Design a protein around this nucleic acid. Structure first.
Ligand SMILES: [Mg+2]
Ligand SMILES: [Mg+2]
Ligand SMILES: [Mg+2]
Ligand SMILES: [Mg+2]
Ligand SMILES: [Mg+2]
Ligand SMILES: [Mg+2]
Ligand SMILES: [Mg+2]
Ligand SMILES: [Mg+2]
Ligand SMILES: [Mg+2]
Ligand SMILES: [Mg+2]
Ligand SMILES: [Mg+2]
Ligand SMILES: [Mg+2]
Ligand SMILES: [Mg+2]
Ligand SMILES: [Mg+2]
Ligand SMILES: [Mg+2]
Ligand SMILES: [Mg+2]
Ligand SMILES: [Mg+2]
Ligand SMILES: [Mg+2]
Ligand SMILES: [Mg+2]
Ligand SMILES: [Mg+2]
Ligand SMILES: [Mg+2]
Ligand SMILES: [Mg+2]
Ligand SMILES: [Mg+2]
Ligand SMILES: [Mg+2]
Ligand SMILES: [Mg+2]
Ligand SMILES: [Mg+2]
Ligand SMILES: [Mg+2]
Ligand SMILES: [Mg+2]
Ligand SMILES: [Mg+2]
Ligand SMILES: [Mg+2]
Ligand SMILES: [Mg+2]
Ligand SMILES: [Mg+2]
Ligand SMILES: [Mg+2]
Ligand SMILES: [Mg+2]
Ligand SMILES: [Mg+2]
Ligand SMILES: [Mg+2]
Ligand SMILES: [Mg+2]
Ligand SMILES: [Mg+2]
Ligand SMILES: [Mg+2]
Ligand SMILES: [Mg+2]
Ligand SMILES: [Mg+2]
Lengths: 117, 57, 129, 98, 142, 69
RNA sequence: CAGUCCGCGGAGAAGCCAUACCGGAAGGAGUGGUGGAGCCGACUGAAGUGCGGAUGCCGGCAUGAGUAACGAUAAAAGAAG
RNA sequence: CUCCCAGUGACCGAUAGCGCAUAGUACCGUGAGGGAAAGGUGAAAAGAACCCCGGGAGGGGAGUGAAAGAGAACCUGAAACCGUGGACUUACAAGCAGUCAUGGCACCUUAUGCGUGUUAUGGCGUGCCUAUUGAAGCAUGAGCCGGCGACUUAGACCUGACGU
């Protein structure tokens, strides 16, 4: 029994070409380069999914020391004062949302600063 | 000797090259002594008048 | 306002192509032909009649004749009013290609592409707007 | 305003309908009463072990599987490509505590 | 999940430079431009204040630096080499010195170019921008 | 039975080795290494310096009895 | 491809085309659009059975590009058809 | 044994199968000799009277027909590749072409969402294979898409695992 490739190959090809649809030039329309661009695409995907936490952690911290210094403390001293009172265990992201609500942030700043004295 | 081009030239850069091949439409203008159109500083092809009739046909 | 199946729609609605003309297999490079076909496009079908007639290219002949057929079937077949007609559409796609051998130096041959042209134009009433 | 701190539950002064990671109490039965470390009720901010005084209830709404993700991995010149499926289970809940 | 805002703010400030070290003042202006003083609401957008230096020509270089500091800048041409202007004779056009610092620390990207806009050096005691009504801000940091 | 319910005994038929056929299993080179005499058949069984050679003491016939314990 | 079931089909099969759905992956479904005559699903058996590469082969179509040239430097011009 | 005949097939079905769906023709060679592509209206020709633009060629109507979304470059008609139109965009930009994130615009037929298309800015980021101590390499291969294309068969063989 013969069994030519036929419909199989072209199914696979169209799948790849359909993953690759934002892409520039023949990264979008030829298979070979489509599949090749997707190789590095997989690398970059799997990297960023756990690096994105690094970036967002940066953005949280970076937003926290801004209000810290806005009041005349700073990130290192302010989280050391929110740690020196045991009871503050909220994530930095929630300290950011508080940095978007100045009154509560200042309440935590005076709380923290009443713990390094 | 024998220079050759290196990498095949892409669709897009090719089109930027051809960006200048746009044709220039003739500035046609209608014959005062006839119906049809005529090129400026030429005789009307249809009538043959450059002021009287100039060409035969 | 629609039928049962495509088998019925094929019988009852026969689908016409108003304003349409196409000139197939024109022995010319399309690449050359579009150069004028762009000039015509979107313009009053009389300006197309005049433009096409002074632009100085061999390719202007076939693109002339088609334009008439567009207007012809715009008027004989489609009841359209010729003081409305205009070039709503114009484009050329490539037809087949005659390939020929051509000898070159030191005994090599090459292959040479005599491209054909499918010019096509679709006039319509300037009743749009 | 306020949000779940992902690590399990636990949050601050909200009122909404948010997803989170799965709860091991199935149905809408849970009626979960979570502890919260912060609150702006009455615009009166309260935090710390003050927030171990207050607690907020919230019914469980629905168990669920999130939008699909592939796990793809690559390394150059080694052949080696990898590909796997994944969707994260969760238990969406709506809030109505103190 | 995270709050982001609109770029609705536009804020104007007059940094002084007289008696200040260069660099010390320059990092303060680079921080205010790049947005760190307000809750740096995004990397994506430039929310920094507009910064109007005055009396820049009274700037202080704290070492021997007023001499022997150098200012290499290449004109593409060979022999267009290190076209070294270096010193206090660059205080023949003082303002660019200060620019060159903060642009030394402002980002090198598309955005990083574009923020240099908002740096408004003025070597004299006077500036045009009274229509902006810039707000005073002290050279000491804390 | 009804014959589409037939199945051979579990583990009474293993499938083949499709050596070749890419990165999910047994890839570029099949089972073979990188180079060497792993190419097309030929050598058989001998070390190709020396034979492991020993002397021969020699005789040609025999004729056994059938055995009955 | 084969054997045996279950079936489907001119109110329309395979094939082709989109698609945000589904399984852990190879994959597989739903719906829509061509198409117009055969075909899916399950169990088993056999294979010419899975391609990006071999300056691989047959084929079509690109780039160079409207580029080099139009094959002796014995020139051609007007009328009229 | 099989030029030839019949029958049959877990044999092929137009790059397969004989080289040939016919042809040892075309074509290549002074010669001995080498040596191709192959195909498909439709049920039936009813194979498009007649009219229109054009010398034509080609096309639009009308009819025939179930279908002309079949019309003789006549089954389907994938990809490269060439175009036409519309959304979003682009003319201080440095760039393995992507990856995550945020915003702007568009849209709502597995689809008002942990949405689809696009996009600006931020961060991040040395094509693939091979051969290698070591590859983004300025090491090899490769224009691009398709399709052919490589671990098989044999035997009263030897050896092992599993099953009866
Ligand atoms: Mg990355
Ligand atoms: Mg030379
Ligand atoms: Mg009818
Ligand atoms: Mg052809
Ligand atoms: Mg390695
Ligand atoms: Mg294996
Ligand atoms: Mg090898
Ligand atoms: Mg070796
Ligand atoms: Mg041998
Ligand atoms: Mg032997
Ligand atoms: Mg159907
Ligand atoms: Mg599918
Ligand atoms: Mg039929
Ligand atoms: Mg079949
Ligand atoms: Mg094979
Ligand atoms: Mg390979
Ligand atoms: Mg290939
Ligand atoms: Mg080729
Ligand atoms: Mg030239
Ligand atoms: Mg020339
Ligand atoms: Mg010559
Ligand atoms: Mg003559
Ligand atoms: Mg005369
Ligand atoms: Mg054949
Ligand atoms: Mg074929
Ligand atoms: Mg033959
Ligand atoms: Mg002959
Ligand atoms: Mg024809
Ligand atoms: Mg047709
Ligand atoms: Mg058709
Ligand atoms: Mg025909
Ligand atoms: Mg048929
Ligand atoms: Mg066809
Ligand atoms: Mg710009
Ligand atoms: Mg550039
Ligand atoms: Mg790498
Ligand atoms: Mg070496
Ligand atoms: Mg290389
Ligand atoms: Mg090369
Ligand atoms: Mg024997
Ligand atoms: Mg045994």
């Amino acid at each position: 029994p013969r069994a030519k490739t036929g419909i199989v190959r072209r199914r696979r090809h169209k799948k790849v070409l359909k993953r690759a649809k934002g892409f520039w030039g023949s990264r979008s329309k030829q298979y070979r380069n489509a599949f090749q661009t997707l190789l590095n695409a997989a690398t970059y995907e799997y990297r960023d999914r756990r690096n994105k936490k690094r970036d967002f952690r940066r953005l949280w911290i970076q937003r926290i020391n801004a209000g810290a210094r806005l009041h005349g403390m700073n990130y290192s001293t302010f989280i050391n004062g929110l740690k020196r009172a045991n009871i503050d265990l909220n994530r930095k992201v929630l300290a950011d949302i508080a940095a978007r609500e100045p009154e509560a942030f200042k309440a935590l700043v005076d709380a923290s600063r009443n713990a390094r004295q | 000797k024998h220079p050759v081009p290196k990498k095949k030239t892409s669709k897009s850069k090719r089109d930027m090259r051809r960006s200048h091949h746009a044709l220039t439409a003739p500035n046609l203008t209608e014959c005062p002594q006839c119906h049809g159109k005529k090129l400026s500083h030429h005789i009307c092809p249809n009538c043959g008048y450059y002021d009287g009739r100039q060409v035969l046909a | 306002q629609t039928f049962r199946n495509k088998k019925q729609r094929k019988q009852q609605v026969k689908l016409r192509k108003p304003g349409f003309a196409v000139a197939k297999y024109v022995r010319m490079s399309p690449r050359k032909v579009r150069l004028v076909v762009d000039v015509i496009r979107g313009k009053s079908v009389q300006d197309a009649e005049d433009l096409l007639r002074f632009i100085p290219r061999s390719a202007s002949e076939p693109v002339a004749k088609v334009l008439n057929s567009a207007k012809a079937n715009a008027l004989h077949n489609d009841e359209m009013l010729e003081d409305r007609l205009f070039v709503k559409e114009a484009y050329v796609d490539a037809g087949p290609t005659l390939k020929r051998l051509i000898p070159r130096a030191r005994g090599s041959a090459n292959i040479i592409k005599k491209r054909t042209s499918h010019i096509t134009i679709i006039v319509a009433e300037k009743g749009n707007k | 305003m306020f949000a779940i701190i992902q690590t399990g539950g636990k949050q601050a002064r909200v009122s909404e309908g948010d997803v989170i990671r799965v709860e091991s109490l199935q149905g809408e039965a849970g009626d979960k009463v979570e502890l919260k470390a912060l609150f702006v009720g009455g615009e009166q901010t309260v935090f710390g072990e003050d927030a171990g005084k207050y607690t907020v209830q919230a019914e469980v709404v629905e168990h669920g599987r999130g939008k699909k993700i592939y796990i793809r991995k690559y390394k150059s010149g080694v052949q080696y490509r990898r590909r796997t499926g994944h969707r994260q289970n969760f238990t969406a809940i709506k809030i109505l505590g103190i | 999940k995270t709050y982001i805002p609109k770029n609705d703010e536009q804020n104007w400030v007059v940094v002084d430079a007289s008696g200040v070290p260069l660099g010390r003042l320059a990092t303060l202006i680079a921080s205010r431009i790049r947005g760190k003083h307000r809750p740096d609401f995004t990397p994506n957008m430039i929310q920094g204040d507009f910064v109007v230096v005055i009396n820049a020509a009274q700037v202080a270089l704290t070492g021997k630096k007023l001499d022997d500091k150098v200012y290499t800048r290449y004109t593409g041409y060979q022999g267009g080499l290190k076209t070294e202007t270096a010193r206090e004779a660059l205080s023949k056009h003082p303002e660019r010195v200060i620019e060159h610092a903060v642009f030394g620390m402002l980002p090198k990207g598309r955005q990083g170019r574009a923020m240099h806009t908002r740096l408004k050096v003025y070597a004299g005691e006077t500036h045009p921008h009274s229509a902006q009504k810039p707000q005073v801000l002290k050279t000491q940091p804390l | 039975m009804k014959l589409h319910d037939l199945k051979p005994t579990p583990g009474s038929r293993k499938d083949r080795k499709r050596v070749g056929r890419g990165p999910g299993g047994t890839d570029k080179t099949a089972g073979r290494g990188h180079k060497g005499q792993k190419s097309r058949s030929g050598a058989g069984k001998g070390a190709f310096f020396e034979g492991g050679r020993s002397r021969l003491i020699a005789r040609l016939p025999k004729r056994g009895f059938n055995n009955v314990g």
